[PDB]
Amino acid sequence: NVMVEPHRHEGVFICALVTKNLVPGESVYGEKRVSISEGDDKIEYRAWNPFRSKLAAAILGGVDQIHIKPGAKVLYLGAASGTTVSHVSDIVGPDGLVYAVEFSHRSGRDLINLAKKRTNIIPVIEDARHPHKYRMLIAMVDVIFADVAQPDQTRIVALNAHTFLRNGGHFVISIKANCIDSTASAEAVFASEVKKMQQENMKPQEQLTLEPYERDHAVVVGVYRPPP
Ligand SMILES: Cc1cn2cc(C(F)(F)F)cc2c(=O)[nH]1
């Protein structure tokens, strides 16, 4: 009787959506934990709330790729207090790495406390608009995840990609249309942001919206193909 099944995405499971807890016995944001013991074996999973995590919403909504997988090196822009980062940390595991970039010092304290238990998280308490200031800390990454909310933030993501993202690496970008231009339609916003990505050789491969978890919110996944 398999109680928790591997999901199509490596490192993700269905029980609904859960990740394997990198720190058994501890929750990050009050989420339920499910520990399964058989003999001397024991594995714990943490529930992943699509109402607080746009990545979980996107997975439940059927995104084809997330590019966050065991061993991956991830640059996470807008890490906040670490809710989604904690699950990314679970997925990439001890051989992966998550750079958790966050501008707020208050949020940063939560990220620092989270990363005390998780070796694979590096809090970077800096303004992502100016990646030259922390470039010496960031090893080249496989995937960038970003929470974009202003009409200048796709460009911020791109500037980080140009500095940190490997050729042929990937990006996963959440777009809150209301925050980019509340006077535009969600479709005008999403089309405009996709255009900004393409201008920076960030080539979308898929996109989806996040109902019923969020209103007028899209996740765009794609591939970075800079010129020589
Ligand atoms: C909550 C939050 C979101 N965010 C998004 C960006 C980027 F501009 F890189 F997209 C940076 C941040 C950040 O420091 N905090």
Cα–Cα distance between 191 and 186 in angstroms, integer?
Answer: 9
For ligand 1, the distance from its centroid to the CA atom of residue 3, given in whole angstroms, is 37
Where along the chain do its domains lie?
5-47, 54-224
Cβ neighbourhood burial of 34 (10 Å; 0-12, 13-18, 19+): middle
* Residue 19 labeled ligand binder: no
CATH number for the domain formed by residue range(s) 54-224: 3.40.50.150
CB atoms within 10 A of CB 15: 14
* Residue 147 labeled ligand binder: yes
* Residue 103 labeled ligand binder: yes
Q: What are phi and psi of 132, to 5 degrees?
A: -60, -25
CB atoms within 10 A of CB 159: 16
Cβ neighbourhood burial of 178 (10 Å; 0-12, 13-18, 19+): middle
| PDB experimental method | X-ray
User: What is the resolution of the experimental data for this entry, in Å?
Assistant: 1.8
Residue 160 Cα: closest atom of ligand 1: 9
Q: Closest Cα to atom 13, ligand 1: which residue?
A: 78
Residue 129 Cα: closest atom of ligand 1: 8
For residue 65, give the DSSP letter: -
Pocket test for ligand 1, best of 147, 152, 155 (most atoms within 8 A of CB): 147
* CATH class (in words) of the domain with range 5-47: alpha beta
Q: Are strands 165-176 and 141-148 parallel, antiparallel or unpaired?
A: parallel
Pinpoint the alpha helices (H) of the chain.
Answer: 54-60, 83-92, 105-117, 153-164, 177-180, 186-199
* Residue 164 labeled ligand binder: no
CA 74: distance to chain centroid?
Answer: 8
